Amino acid sequence: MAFNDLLKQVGGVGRFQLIQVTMVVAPLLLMASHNTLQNFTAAIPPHHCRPPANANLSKDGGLEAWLPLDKQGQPESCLRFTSTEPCIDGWVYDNSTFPSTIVTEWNLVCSHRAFRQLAQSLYMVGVLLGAMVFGYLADRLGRRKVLILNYLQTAVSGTCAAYAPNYTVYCVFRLLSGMSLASIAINCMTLNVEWMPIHTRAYVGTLIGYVYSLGQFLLAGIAYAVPHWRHLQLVVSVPFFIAFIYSWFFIESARWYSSSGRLDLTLRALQRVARINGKQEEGAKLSIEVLRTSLQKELTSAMELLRCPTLRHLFLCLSMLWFATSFAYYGLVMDLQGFGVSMYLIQVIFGAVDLPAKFVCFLVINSMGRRPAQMASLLLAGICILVNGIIPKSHTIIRTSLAVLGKGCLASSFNCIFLYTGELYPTVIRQTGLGMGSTMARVGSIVSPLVSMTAEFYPSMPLFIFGAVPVVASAVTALLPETLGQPLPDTVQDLKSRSRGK
Amino acid sequence: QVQLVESGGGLVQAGGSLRLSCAASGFPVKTEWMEWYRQAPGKEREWVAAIWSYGSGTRYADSVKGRFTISRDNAKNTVYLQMNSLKPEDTAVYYCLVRVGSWYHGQGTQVTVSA
Numbered sequence: 226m227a228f229n230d231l232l233k234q235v236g237g238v239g240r241f242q243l244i245q246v247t248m249v250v251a252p253l254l255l256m257a258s259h260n261t262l263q264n265f266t267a268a269i270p271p272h273h274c275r276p277p278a279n280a281n282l283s284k285d286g287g288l289e290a291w292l293p294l295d296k297q298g299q300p301e302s303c304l305r306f307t308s309t310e311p312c313i314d315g316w317v318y319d320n321s322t323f324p325s326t327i328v329t330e331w332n333l334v335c336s337h338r339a340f341r342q343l344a345q346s347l348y349m350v351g352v353l354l355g356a357m358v359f360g361y362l363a364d365r366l367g368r369r370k371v372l373i374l375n376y377l378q379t380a381v382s383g384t385c386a387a388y389a390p391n392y393t394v395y396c397v398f399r400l401l402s403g404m405s406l407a408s409i410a411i412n413c414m415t416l417n418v419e420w421m422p423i424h425t426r427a428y429v430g431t432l433i434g435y436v437y438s439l440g441q442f443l444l445a446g447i448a449y450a451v452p453h454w455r456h457l458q459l460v461v462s463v464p465f466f467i468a469f470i471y472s473w474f475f476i477e478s479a480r481w482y483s484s485s486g487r488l489d490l491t492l493r494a495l496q497r498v499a500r501i502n503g504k505q506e507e508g509a510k511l512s513i514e515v516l517r518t519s520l521q522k523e524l525t526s527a528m529e530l531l532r533c534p535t536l537r538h539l540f541l542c543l544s545m546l547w548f549a550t551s552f553a554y555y556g557l558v559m560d561l562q563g564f565g566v567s568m569y570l571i572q573v574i575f576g577a578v579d580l581p582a583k584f585v586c587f588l589v590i591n592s593m594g595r596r597p598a599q600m601a602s603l604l605l606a607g608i609c610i611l612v613n614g615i616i617p618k619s620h621t622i623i624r625t626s627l628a629v630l631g632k633g634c635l636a637s638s639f640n641c642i643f644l645y646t647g648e649l650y651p652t653v654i655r656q657t658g659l660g661m662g663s664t665m666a667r668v669g670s671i672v673s674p675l676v677s678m679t680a681e682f683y684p685s686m687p688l689f690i691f692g693a694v695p696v697v698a699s700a701v702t703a704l705l706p707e708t709l710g711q712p713l714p715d716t717v718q719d720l721k722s723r724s725r726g727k
Numbered sequence: 728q729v730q731l732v733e734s735g736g737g738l739v740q741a742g743g744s745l746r747l748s749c750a751a752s753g754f755p756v757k758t759e760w761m762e763w764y765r766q767a768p769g770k771e772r773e774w775v776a777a778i779w780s781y782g783s784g785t786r787y788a789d790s791v792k793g794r795f796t797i798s799r800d801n802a803k804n805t806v807y808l809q810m811n812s813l814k815p816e817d818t819a820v821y822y823c824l825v826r827v828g829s830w831y832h833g834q835g836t837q838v839t840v841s842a
Contacts, residue, residue: 285771286770286771289771290771290772293762293774293827293828294774294777294827295827296779301827301828304827304828305828306772306828308772309828309829309830
């Protein structure tokens, strides 16, 4: 007669739970949109040095007189002739395809090419710091309050970063936006799990995956609709303001209230749900006495994770897997410029291919196996992206399709690694294991733009790293034991016994 | 320093052939960028042909494709460029660089095609 019993006592599949789960999971479309917005608003259009006004361009026979030509025939993107000298009167950007981006507005083309990736790295370190510190603050403070502050901060950061006058302001406010966004995602999934019964957690996860895929599609569509970058960021971040406006109607998880040592608020929330769900007598059956008689068992760290040596090795393996998966995924997703096709179509097809990958991954894990699924997905994705980097830019359809299959394999690998990290870890630190896996994944997502920044030395070195890291990850995680069997570790005593079992 | 003294200027009838070259120093012809530029009287710096490191290939311009021949020479650190069936609009001073935009460039050689 635990908290789950009381949850099914008042509905459990009722209108209140559904309305809250949709009202809470809706902004994840904007989550994905803001995640990929740095990719879609930092598009680099063709550019070249602007000749000085000392000599008129009419007698120059065009702009090609004072512009050296590169390998492909376009004018040089950083350097200019003296009648050499570098770009000293700014750059000229064509607005045929991309009206305005951050690089176009702030001349982040030559000798500033690193800042375009540095802004994304700042957003990712924001995501990591936000996840950590706001998970701590949500455990210490609450869930509904953290969520509403997350909505407010996301909206404020989005607006005041789209209206950034300088670049440092933009990077700092993207840092804050990543903070808020990681916090809202983690607290969204946590609250949805906490207020739903045990039977529907898998349905909640499937819904969140569908929502992310639909958000990718929505980003593609809106970005097709809005060509600018300030206007795109406004139209992507403003709905978070109405999200904050309506998020005061949320009902916080009663499980957290019970874990906080206060039961009157839990009782109040229970009959609040009862009134919303329409069943009044069932809520009236609840009382102060019945609360402790139902949650007596419920009412009554990294260190301990790293003390045990075999646990330390398992943690190192899973951390490497998470790091490599997120690193490759965010190194591949944010390179849509070099596919030779309009970003809208490739983003749409990415969103389309996200789901069949999930289907195939589910089939192989629940029918064939888990370790073969992880191996196939990770190794094949790494090989595909590596050979995509090797294949020259002359061909476009093959590279685009290759990467369309890559992204799907990365999504399947994400599902597989989440299932692993939630499965092999003992229940003592299973949540700690999930947190550490997500933290290492965000560390990888931090590092990946830094690696991609080093594209000035070689034109395929970032892609070579993106394609080589998953291979090393598979090589070092091949030693992970199979876990298709029913036995699921609970404490730390059977971890060595499970190794003894195999 | 780097010196790019060039020679080959003269008068040749249309349809003839004479080779152009600039004597480079301090670098070989198989390591870095190298181009050829024209400027007819009243015309601008028109790019003619390009050679990259290690003989990556051959490439010309719109009015230059299928009409011009460019050949390198690793022995004397020079580029030996020949032209046959001389266009009568190609009266220009020939320039050679050491990169695609560089601090060192040739002094100049002027040829006449006449008729």
